[PDB]
Amino acid sequence: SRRYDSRTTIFSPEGRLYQVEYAMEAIGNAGSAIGILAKDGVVLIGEKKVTSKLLQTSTSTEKMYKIDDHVACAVAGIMSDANILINTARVQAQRYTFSYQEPMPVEQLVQSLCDTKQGYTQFGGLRPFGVSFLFAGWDKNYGFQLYMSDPSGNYGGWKATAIGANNQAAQSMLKQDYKDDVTREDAVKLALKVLSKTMDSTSLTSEKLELAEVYLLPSGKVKYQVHSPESLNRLLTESGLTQPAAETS
């Protein structure tokens, strides 16, 4: 029976764990998603990988999930494992709100999920979760926050970051173009621009996209909401018009 063991949790002569690196590769092969931490909110946009025309698309989302009233996530990687991880994350958030009776601060939710992942990374001989998350939420502690999780069980806060396919090009354009004080509209526009410029196909189609934004309603209520296809159409047209509105000179 020993000979059938792959020994997933083990150090290579380089001092790095192979299975987690293969997990990051699997993320790299998955659909792209990026996050923009705006002054007045946080925006997550994602690419629906499977885009056969027979897909129903009436389901609200395939890559972004609500984890609590104040936190949402955008998934990249093996969505099969991502379902389990989001189920756990919602459970952990509710467990905090039960014990303490208040929303679970985003950073803690991210850290608890990452501690779930590191467990598979360190002991037991099971394959790690091949997933990577972008977390958007709001706290009394720190206000709007955006976090990114590796399948290594490591995470970090990002003013704007991307995951999945063609990650680094979008990362570079975010480096070049993101600025502080980016508001709601500016964040939405920048996300659409950077994605489409990172997409293999311009003039994107609303059926092949997802846009979600966790902003704060006038009456201090964190309102998460994912744009309906017609709202995506309006934004796509406005962006496909405003891109030439800048590139003209």
Binding site: S12, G15, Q122, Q145, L146, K175
Partner: protein, 240 residues
């Protein structure tokens, strides 16, 4: 449960998995600790400032207790688990004994915890090498320690871990002197500057006074960096 001897002896008596953990340590951010007469400084290579990181909600030099602080090098994922267990022990000691944990005690606890992992069946060793710091209660005499993936630990006048650990260690071996006040911070900053020459925007430094830990501000690190960058050029010009 999954029982498999991940760590085992190589035909020449070496623990290959422990040594690969050590290599994983080599790849981690550089860290430095310089015990002074009245303070114990810590420093690390990267303060998470690549122009887009939102580092408001996490510091590298981490409190296990208002009594004690910790700097870690190696995998960041394991550091969280080790630090959580160290914090839990720091509290559980106060519960079991009114006295707060002495620096050597918590260092020894972390070290034994690491050894357990290098020998327990079916679990991967921690790929970490921690630097620990604190003022033993009722003593006001600073203390500096480290652990290494093997589970063995020892005190130090000063030390470094992470990438280029050796070069920083030679710098300390030639440049260490019994410092006080700002002088300890100066030595720690110089020691880190040896390897992170892109000073200021990368270091994260904290100083342990008898009354606790507190982390330097960007302006303060920049002031020290400018001071050293001026005085070193002045000394080099004078000598040459």
């Amino acid at each position: 449960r999954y029982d498999r001897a991940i760590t085992v002896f190589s035909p020449d008596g070496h623990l290959f998995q422990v040594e690969y953990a050590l290599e994983a340590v080599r790849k981690g951010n550089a860290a430095v600790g310089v015990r002074g007469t009245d303070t114990v400084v810590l420093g690390v290579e990267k303060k998470s400032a690549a122009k887009l990181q939102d580092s408001r909600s996490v510091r590298k030099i981490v409190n296990l207790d208002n009594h004690i602080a910790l700097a870690c090098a190696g995998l960041k994922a394991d550091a969280r688990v080790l630090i959580n267990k160290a914090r839990i022990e720091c509290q559980s000691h106060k519960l079991t004994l009114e006295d707060p944990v002495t620096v050597e005690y918590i260092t020894r606890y972390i070290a034994g915890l690491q050894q357990k992992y290098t020998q327990s069946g079916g679990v991967r060793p921690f790929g970490l090498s921690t630097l620990i710091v604190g003022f033993d209660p009722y003593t006001d005499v600073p203390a500096l320690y480290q652990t290494d993936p093997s589970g063995t630990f020892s005190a130090w006048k000063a030390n470094a871990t992470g990438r280029n650990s050796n070069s920083i260690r030679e710098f300390l071996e030639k440049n260490y002197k019994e410092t006080s006040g700002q002088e300890t911070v100066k030595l720690a900053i110089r020691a880190l500057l040896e390897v992170v020459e892109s000073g200021g925007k990368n270091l994260e430094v904290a100083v342990m006074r008898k009354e606790g830990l507190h982390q330097l501000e960007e302006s303060e690190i920049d002031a020290i960096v400018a001071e050293i960058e001026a005085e070193k050029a002045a000394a080099e010009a004078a000598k040459k």
